[PDB]
């Protein structure tokens, strides 16, 4: 099956909304959700970083299942930056779509993407679903 | 009674077709109609042929939606707004499930770009935005 890939940074109200939408897509299409979080994996990647990531993924998959979809955790430590990691993973598993959270920001004489969201949306070779 | 799928289309194009096909599939799965939108400002700068082309694009787009087995409606927006604000406000007004929009992906010089309308729709929207290449 071609999964829904959902990228989560941390546990947050936004992440929950992202996961709920991803679960709905998966339920409708009859495919599992692969929940991903990316770390580089060098000397800079600390114990607590990995702890938090594992907790986030465990929580995320529980949300997917509660919303009536099948979910799997995929921690990625592949020596890549997160956007490239997410995009490459999505291609590797032949994802139907990537689901990501975006910060809802009002304009301040300028209106900008976070570097991670920007690069996921633009570099992906799959549909990208952006949730606030 | 229903929360529609909103699809923003610029012109008749291969990209627009892919956008519409994805939107139709979302609509078929959810059992909701597709509202196809195109935005113009509507002052003296907006010429008659601009409006004609936009109406033709919407008519074409709805035919694609129906061919893909979904219910579609045309919604031309001439409301004195910039396209991104217009699309985002429309989606809120109709309580859309999601906005589906096309992304330009590459510039003539191979730069990774959204396209100015899609970029601002993605950032400004309150609704989920589905980005199709
Ligand atoms: Cl998030
Ligand atoms: Cl279901
Ligand atoms: Cl388009
Ligand atoms: Cl129809
Ligand atoms: Cl851009
Ligand atoms: Cl553009």
Numbering used by the authors:
A (entry chain B): 3 to 134
B (entry chain A): 2 to 134
Which statements did the authors publish about this structure?
Universal stress proteins (USP) are widely spread proteins in nature. In stress conditions such as heat shock, nutrient starvation, the presence of oxidants, uncouplers, DNA-damaging agents, or other stress agents which may arrest cell growth, USP constitute a natural biological defense mechanism. Here, we present the structures of both apo- and cofactor-bound forms of an euryarchaeal USP AF0826 from A. fulgidus and a bacterial USP NE1028 from N. europaea.
The structure of the apo form of AF0826, a euryarchaeal USP from A. fulgidus was refined to a final resolution of 1.97 Å. In all other known USP structures, the residues found between strands β4 and β5 region form a loop. AF0826 displays the same type 1 dimerization, the dimerization interface is formed by β5 and α4 from each monomer as it takes place is case of NE1028.
